[model samples]
Target: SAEEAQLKVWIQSQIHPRELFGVLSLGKRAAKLDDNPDFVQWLRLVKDFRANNGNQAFSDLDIYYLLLKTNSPEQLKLLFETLRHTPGMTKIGASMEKSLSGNWIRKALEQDTYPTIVYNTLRLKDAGTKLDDTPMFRQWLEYVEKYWNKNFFGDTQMLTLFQKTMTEEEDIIKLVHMLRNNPGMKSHADKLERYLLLTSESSHKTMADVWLKARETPEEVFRILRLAEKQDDNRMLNLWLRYTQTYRDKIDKNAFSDAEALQFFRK
Candidate 1:
């Protein structure tokens, strides 16, 4: 039964490499056969032979690239989960980070069709920088901050989604989907505004508590208030006014007031 299933799934995978629905169907089949250590060992041997011959021929890189091309969050999550647990695939996880710094990964992230690439890049960058002892990682961090911060961070789509969720009280699932599809939308300004509103309504005791729970920088919070004043949104401006008075001592003295906040919003 295991061999028959594996053969059938292998046939399906070869035919539908780009279709994540098909790939996942095959993945499930593979999982069913995983209890057969003999089959699993054979699979690893084949994968290893292919990898040793040439990385371009058949490797985790090729498999992951296919997963990335699908741009399906469910599929990507499954691939990563599977790779993390696979007996011989822990090295594959390390290889993934190394591949990420390559040209193919960089180009893929720039393509709007694959927003997941941007998110994955950030995740890899964060992971790699934490573990790396080399100065190369520091330089890489600078590059990440320069390009990723400007091009993908705090994007309009991200801001709009957050604002809509806050105003409409949308479910958290929808919010997660929004973030997954629009990875470029991570504006500090929007994040801060959202946290400020959330904190006020919840009666959070400290700015630190708000930051800790929200998981964003203080500057990000300040950016939102500044933007609110710029748009002359009387409602947002008023919210900032209330926030400033309540946490006057806790907040930075140089934090923007209503007038200064408005002027700095656009920038």
Candidate 2:
């Protein structure tokens, strides 16, 4: 217990950089150790903070500290081995499933860890891991499934993450496949497909050419136009406008008419 407390202090010191409040408080307690009444009060305060904020980013580090202090490497190795062999993994997976459905999970997934986790999972699955059967594994699978289907739209945070991270043809193809399988995603799907088509590298080709060559719509022309508007790229704007003028009739009218279509362009 003393070791865990010391480890907590170490982790807090590492994370806070300039903020010495936690360390200072620890120091005060250490200095007045003989004053049992004061020490107990401070201990309670620290424990409460840890309990309430255990899920916070810094708290994750705190957990690492605690684990390091309390457990040996051999113990941790045995625990993980036991987990893999038993139903503990499944239970943890179920807990993750429940946790991921929360608003905080959505935010943290999209903002802090979702993209890396998604890519890593994809890599793992590509290597032939059967992720769908595992509970925590299934939870992330569902996220990727929904994200690819655009079920998380209207959340600007999610969209922003998508825009920043989605680049590969495989990624877009996965998204298209997800949308095709989920009919509820059809509405936003077309807009996303068309926008991607308009800005994608397949613009030089016909719609049929694009459909065959691209995994999603190539909306590079539209993207360029938006970039022009934002950065005042007159040369790029001229090129984009020229491209739009040439293909205006060929572009999917339905895609442009969707509410998200307007929102995308307005952005």
Candidate 3:
């Protein structure tokens, strides 16, 4: 243990131990261990040594990352299952996701996402990665199809509201409104709306309809603008402003609460 004195001192620093392990493992674990049964067994022996020694050594230096980085998905799976109570399992789960690639993502599908924190880090938060039209989104849909619990996923009407995840229908609508007006994403709106019309019985409101409705119904559009004030997604809020303003010719401005609300859209 004395040999690790310097290492122990370093764990107390701002440098995250998980990151340190990752930097050191830049080209090590995959080659040495690579899911070798002997290495897995040896690692278990090391855990026992720490456990039998009263586990004080691991008290300071969190090593869930140390245990998680592995090429063998099975070992990674086992570590997750056996070490569920290990400190910072969710953090390790997020860390684990950054290590996997597209192929591993498919294989990782067969594994559980809850206990090891896969659902939140990978499935739920997947949209935060690629917001535009790329194949990545539907693959997440594929994950939902394969992994998300059908009964408890969300409102059955939910997926129809938002294309990517279970974000609220109102917010999703605001997002679509923004996207339709978005030059970069405008082409995508019709495609998603068409997909919805074909796939969902409840899904309605195409870009064609919503844009016009926003013009004819000032109260409706103004209502969303008011609701948007309570919203925090700055990017989406900005998009909503652009969507409503472009068609201002169609809407009556008298419906607004006051001048600030009218002035708010100018930005």
Candidate 4:
């Protein structure tokens, strides 16, 4: 350990002249003592490595190894910032840019704004992950409704996120109401209804109750009957039959008002 400390001091002194060798081995050794105060100090020094004599002080390979050894979000974020502005490795800079974007997304998640969330969601999508695909993002979506409203539907990304994240009954009901009020969101609203009908058995019964309160038109019920028939979901059809019989008064018996509903009713 003392030898490693002495070696770090020697490496630091030799860094400016581009005389450093065996730096990667020392970097590898540092991984074992990653949380060591001395190693952190050494990492701080390395983070401060800059251009000297019109050339960067460390090789990209060595810098990459040091970044690997410096394994914390704060540290990675700091190193990414530090390396970005300094004229260093082009190849390593690209790598750092990608890694930093991920860290940037993490920071954005905590103090999320609609713009930043959408921007980072696109960034994550570009990097082969969808923001809506994460449980954390879905949980974050639940709290976001406090600041969001019907006005958000005009933004298709926001609308899509809401549609994709509506696993909760309240949120699903809210989405149904919002979509019904916005004629532009009608197709998406239909997709949500299909999603509820196609849930697993226990969840199917729960959404059956959700549908009873959420969509109070016999025509909508008839439409669901058609969807269940198309999907061969007899379980959903059975629930629909029971609910319609028990809650007949809830239906907006104005089904005859619509030609399609009249046709569906006659059948």
Candidate 5:
């Protein structure tokens, strides 16, 4: 049991960075020595902070400190949701510049503005192994993709597309093929391709896994959708078209929405 516990800490550390990984592993291990008294309380400080969501003045470093420490994707998601809702979101938009090393992004995000951090992240000049996308940036883009579209792909286009998009030669072909017919969404398509090329799959995820995330989709459902491409059936086709339309409520998540879906259905 001790061996496995230590192993978990080791693996978690490799991805999370130094100080944070160190504190969580050693501190928690010591706490779990089985002679422990309040290990559970200490173990959950990060969780509590996440659960403690809501506005708090000048709370940037406080929350980020914990988020940086735990570094669990689930924990990170919880942290992001809470941070986005907290105060100072508007003020943090001042830092629009980006840099290669983590320093610039780190310093800027510490201001506690989720929007600015995310906006900076999307522009990357960002993300790990697959296309070198950062986990934090990946989640940030997905967040903006869904809940924050007003800024992500809005009229102002607050978050510019990443400077480049990268994917494996093999994966890119398939992805590009599926997306070619959806020309109305070339901008969105470009963004997805970039995210896929860049996002990390070091944890054993495939390119398709990363790609599906580009936007929401009913993949198999859509395969048959192509057969209906040349159909003259009005009401029947509209039904499928409406089905796709209903999904548009959450844009940027799906490549084929109303117009795009209809175009593909015709061809």
Candidate 6:
């Protein structure tokens, strides 16, 4: 629009080294437009304006720092493009995570890593941000699954998120393994075993067929053995019984409190 040209001229003619707030005001206005065509056009203009004739002292970093001070979600949205190209952007975004929404946290995760991202995600969840049934939550699941390691057991965030969202038999099985050696999460782990039993019964592949692969830590194996006994799955029970014979010391006999379980290992 000709009016935009006139506005640009006015801004350039009157722009001063100390006029940071004035420039910030314009960006704030554009940000409020919420991804409108003009807002995108203004972003392009901001780049050109900064590169050519804008204040030399008014850096992009300065603008970003000021932009965050406003605490406007839409303004933060404008910075999404800057996240990759701008140095220190992730640090600043993370510093203000308490003020961020789950959707913002989702976008932020693409550029961030562990610990902080984990806490931020859990923080947003605690703040009652609804991520359920959204692509954002799916991405979080993918993030956790992709980066999962032994170190993840130290924090309850991943386990908590999985406990809340996991429905697939494979993921529940994976969670079962994740729980091994992590007695701190025993309450959730026990619940997961119950859920796994239900899923194992309903799945197309029998748990018996997957028994060898499914067995891991003694605790996990014993739970599986108990599950097999409860399901009366002779194939799985026999496999686990034989497994205990070889690793008898590794396997805790006290867990076999039941007479039938005791009989299986008597051989």
What's the TM-score of each model vs. the native? 0.33, 0.29, 0.25, 0.32, 0.24, 0.31
When 3 and 6 are scored with TM-score, the better candidate is 6
When sorted by TM-score, best at the front, the candidate numbers are 1, 4, 6, 2, 3, 5
In model 4, state the lDDT of residue 8.
60
Please state the error at residue 136 of candidate 3 in Å: 7.3
Candidate 3 wrongly placed segments (more than 4 Å): 1-8, 12-100, 108-118, 121-138, 145-267
C-alpha positional error of residue 74 in candidate 6 after TM-score superposition, expressed in Å? 26
Predict model 4's lDDT versus the native.
0.46
Each candidate's lDDT (Cα)? 0.43, 0.41, 0.42, 0.46, 0.40, 0.46
For each candidate, C-alpha RMSD in Å? Answer: 11.2, 16.4, 15.3, 14.0, 14.8, 14.9
For model 3, which pairs clash? none
Candidate topping TM-score: 1
Worst 10 residues of 6 by lDDT: 126-135
Residues 1-267 of candidate 5 have per-residue lDDT tens digits of: 654464455444443222443554543432221454233323233233333443242233333333333344344444345434545332221111112123443444344445545554444332311222234454444444444333223512422333233334444434433543444444555445444334533411343343344443544335433344454455435544544554455544555766677677654
* Candidate 4, residue 212: lDDT: 71
Error of 3 at 44 (Å): 24
Clashes of each: 4, 16, 0, 0, 12, 0
lDDT of 3 by residue, 75-177 (tens): 5545444434444344433433443334545566666443124433433333332222323333444455555542224333333425454354444544555
lDDT ranking, best first: 4, 6, 1, 3, 2, 5
